[model samples]
Target: FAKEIDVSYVKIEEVIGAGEFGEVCRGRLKAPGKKESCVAIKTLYTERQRREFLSEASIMGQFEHPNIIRLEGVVTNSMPVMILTEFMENGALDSFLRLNDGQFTVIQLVGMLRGIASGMRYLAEMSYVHRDLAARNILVNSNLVCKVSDFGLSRFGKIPIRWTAPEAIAFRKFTSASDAWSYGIVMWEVMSFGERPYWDMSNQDVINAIEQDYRLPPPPDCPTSLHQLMLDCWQKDRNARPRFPQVVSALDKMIRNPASLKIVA
Candidate 1:
């Protein structure tokens, strides 16, 4: 049930964030809407970006997992299009880790990965790829439970066209494998106090390095086991990347038996 509601026939609550697509607000809807009444409304202007708004909302609506932020519903009118998602009070992963810096233990890191791997698994299972998978896309609450957010760049896999090798000179295609590559980047992001990927590199430089089979260096605090995992995922050979299920299980084992990972600084 919603905790509160305001007049104007609009669900007035707190505005949490504003993104390129729309403004995300935390609000409550009246009954006849089940128990999960508190929702995040992502509003996009109908006057512009209609197709983009609908496509993004559609992707989120199709994704349902505790670790993946779910779209409760969508409201599309001539004037506006809004996506109602589950409200997460914790905030984005990169920001969350930055605030708590150095305070997180290995266990906490594993918990964060559990959430990420699970959510990425959900995307992979649907045969959908998230071209822009990154730490900023992960969210969590104060309790540390995590969820994956933002699906604007998501797409189902196709032929070789969508799965370009990182060293290829063409625009790569979306693939479950490529998503794994991005997941490695996410791991680095969380473990490195939110360092920018390819630090100080321009877009052209990043592209050039990628074509040269170069990747971001090992994060300052990454353990050997974790570092190896990240490196494996980013290999130019997509087939060499571990599947999401494999990724999660491997991470789970590492978490259970925390290795003395020597951070390859």
Candidate 2:
């Protein structure tokens, strides 16, 4: 039912997932001139969400790195457009971690974080800001490696004047600093094994909380160093948030030196 894209050697099966943007179907694409060779597919209802779908495809296609989801190609039809991508059999990282019930060690956590942070750094360098940087947005493949996804809310970052140095003004705008803030929250979410940023809090309540300097309560197993880093991201001043490069360096250090991730209970 979609137009503007095309795909061959692919047979779409049942719908595997759905979102506001559209539906994702489980499909298979046969290899050229090969009866026994085929690959899975993630067909999105892109025609209904043209701009959103295309933006995601564009970014993913352009971003060919280990830490980011790989886009195979796209299918533009009248209504049932498709975006063939590497299916992560393991699914989203948050759900995976929670399913494991916090059994992962710090080293494993560090590895996942490194992949996410590295991908974030890549997006930042490309001038894209993942407005929704959260654990739910990261996908993990069979190798246990991570990749950032869901580019629907993202856009180019820009520093704005309303962003006064120590508070989120009523009319303040988004920027790279703000993205760093979101990334920090994502880190917290990851550390907590997919806990919600403000679980049970309404949208307005979450907003009020953030406006009131409400920090995410440290999880039972949260390390002190990591807690402080989260606080830094929630600082009143947007400028106070660490840049992606700085974040990468800090995380690298913390990963290398386990003691650095410690915090008093």
Candidate 3:
């Protein structure tokens, strides 16, 4: 549910991140009958930008999953219109994983992937296509849980080339199948501790390479089964790609049987 907030209730602290529309800052919000709580505030500077930001709010306001970022409220009736969301202390998943490389075991990484997949499954059931799914779009909270954020808004033409699916790249088609294709890339990022999907490849190069039936190779020391799952997600035909339910089940199985997550020569 979206709530209209009084602008005076918010206190901006520092700039945390940025997007195409505006800056995302760390802040505190004073909710009714509650002490000040930390939040991440996204600011919109222009009227056009405010509408775009509100569009995202409309999408996010409908969601309330633990693996999805929670939208607290919106300050549209005040200056410097802002969106307030629960503060994720660890920030983006990719950078968080990179900063602590080799610190998490394979099972732990799989757990994080499981959380993401669960979130995607929920979205799939809701018939919501994220369109943009990547490690960078996922946030890591204080508890080390990963939550999917940015419901494909503010990215009309600025998509992350490497993480997008082939069909999406060619025809601008975005379905849950396309999202599964992106999840495969996110798996690669997790295994490689946030390595870029296509190392130093230009946008044109990536498009050409994918059209030529090329797919990303397994990250160094990645488990054989996990890499095979990634291949399943990157199937050339969208119909062949595993849905989010299947993806979540696969991750859960791996989590249950950690021995299955071994690299094969």
Off by over 4 Å in 2: 1-6, 30-48, 77-79, 152-172, 262-264
lDDT to native, each model: 0.72, 0.69, 0.89
TM-score for candidate 3, residues paired by index: 0.95
lDDT of 1 by residue, 17-57 (tens): 88767677888865454463677777773434676666777
Predicted structure with the largest lDDT when compared to the true one = 3
Candidate 1 root-mean-square deviation in Å: 4.8
Top TM-score hit: 3
Question: Which 10-residue window in model 2 sums to the lowest lDDT?
Answer: 159-168
Per-residue error (Å), model 3, residue 194: 0.8
Q: What does candidate 2's lDDT look like per residue over 1-265, in tens digits?
A: 2222345566776666665456666566565554532223544423345766666676677777888877766776544556767677767788888897679876788788888888888888888766666777788887889998876444434422111222333555656677777777777777888876677786667667777777777777788877787787777787778888887888789888998666546
C-alpha lDDT (0 to 100) for residue 144 of candidate 1: 88
Positional deviation of residue 237's Cα in model 2 after best superposition, in angstroms: 1.1
Off by over 4 Å in 3: 152-155
